[PDB]
Subunit: 162 residues, 2 copies
């Protein structure tokens, strides 16, 4: 059973800018297993809009190419929950952030959480932040994850994390 | 830097019989990333020999087929360390076992540990043993792992963990 805890007091305008996907984890192995896995996506930029919506710019391998992708997330009554329709997911969920160093978020499809949940640890610089990873693992300890990936600085600034 | 701690007082004859790979983790993502990854291997049987050597029977995907494989491990002066020449690894390292429920082991290539280290949690029954996984994660906390997989009962009794 998946229960996510979203951030209290999120100010979405402060997440703006460049990020790097330091780590990711998912409920089903197939979601992240192999570079072509559906939720193997690497966040490059978060771009809040004046409406309080959010554009997510990411990279993703598809048909052998490292491709760009833009996901549009719509605000909801809860500030840390946004609605999307992409990657067969329907929610982007912000778990925690300090704006300046790390941000934790998940995606899921609320109709099928155990088949769809993937969460990431994002960082502002392409370095490994052990404190951020500690917060990430803390959150993940409470979730039924079956796959976990953690990247190094070389992979962080690679194209599609190679 | 990899430092492994091998089991004190291992009696190899007691590990005999059927096992299942409940979980696995590795230092480099590529070692386990995708079903075809080099160290994506699923242990079926451990067969100690009268000499104190060890045959390891496993399954592994290769060229689209779920294939059988036998690895012959030679004893060394340390009872929990065996020598092999397979999967580009040269050591099998037993970390801990209670013989009756779980067994923890790694493989590595001592010439290049950070490029080669993969460890597993094995169990006697195709069920999930949270206590065994706790011991596994405990060991892994001290190691620089960058990928982690945990399987369910259906996968445990699948062919090549599908």
């Amino acid at each position: 059973i998946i229960v996510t805890q979203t951030m209290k007091g999120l100010d979405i305008q402060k997440v703006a800018g460049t990020w790097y996907s330091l780590a990711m984890a998912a409920s089903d192995i197939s979601l992240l297993d192999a570079q072509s896995a559906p939720l193997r996506v690497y966040v490059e930029e978060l771009k809040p809009t004046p409406e309080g919506n959010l554009e997510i710019l990411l990279q993703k391998w598809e048909n052998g190419e490292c491709a760009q992708k833009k996901i549009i997330a719509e605000k909801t009554k809860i500030p840390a929950v946004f609605k999307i329709d992409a990657l067969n997911e329907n929610k982007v969920l912000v778990l925690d952030t300090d704006y300046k160093k790390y941000l934790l978020f998940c995606m899921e499809n609320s109709a099928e959480p155990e088949q769809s949940l993937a969460c990431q640890c994002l960082v502002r610089t392409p370095e490994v932040d052990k404190e951020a990873l500690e917060k990430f693992d803390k959150a993940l300890k409470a979730l039924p994850m079956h796959i976990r990936l953690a990247f190094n600085p070389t992979q962080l600034e690679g194209q599609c994390h190679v």
